[PDB]
Amino acid sequence: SLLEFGKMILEETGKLAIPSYSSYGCYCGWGGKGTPKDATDRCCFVHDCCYGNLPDCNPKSDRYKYKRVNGAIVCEKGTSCENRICECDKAAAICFRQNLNTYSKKYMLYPDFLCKGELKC
Ligand SMILES: COc1ccc2cc3[n+](cc2c1OC)CCc1cc2c(cc1-3)OCO2
């Protein structure tokens, strides 16, 4: 759920999910349209696609458990949905940490109208 996702993000990047990653670019948070603006936005795009692979799952509200082993995120065994949701979120948290150097404040609260084009999953 967003509670676990939020905590991963803070742990990885030291930034709070709201508001650093909930209104960023074309894909982070609510949105989903056009071309991702930068690496961080691509992480959100792939994250949206990952959830999109799980029709019959409720990734926003379904809670999973994860632990840290040697600093590494390890998803603990739950239902099938919980496992797969945790793996999507884990990948996004790492992707954010990997692209932290290029995170730009310029893309915070980005315009909807400037999210143009198309990109399939
Ligand atoms: C139902 O309300 C919603 C709806 C959608 C929400 C989406 C997100 N958050 C709260 C939401 C929320 O609650 C305030 C919090 C953090 C976050 C980090 C993210 C992200 C999406 C979100 O994509 C990449 O990184």
Number of structural domains found in the chain = 1
Residues at the annotated binding site for Ca(2+)?
A: 27, 29, 31, 48
CATH number for the domain spanning 71: value is 1.20.90.10
Whole-angstrom Cα distance, residue 97 to residue 99? 6
Residues with CB under 6 A from ligand 1: 2, 6, 17-18, 21-22, 28-29, 44, 47
Note whether 37 and 110 are within 8 A (CB). yes
Encoding tokens for residue 77? Answer: 């065994």
Range of the domain at 72: 1-121
Residue with tokens 């949105």: 31
* Catalytic residue positions, numbered: 47, 89
Q: Whose CA is nearest to atom 17 of ligand 1?
A: 22
HEC readout, 81-119: HHHHHHHHHHHHHHHHHHCHHHCCHHHECCCCCCCCCCC
In order, the DSSP letters of 2-31 are HHHHHHHHHHHHSS-HHHHTTSBTTTSSS-
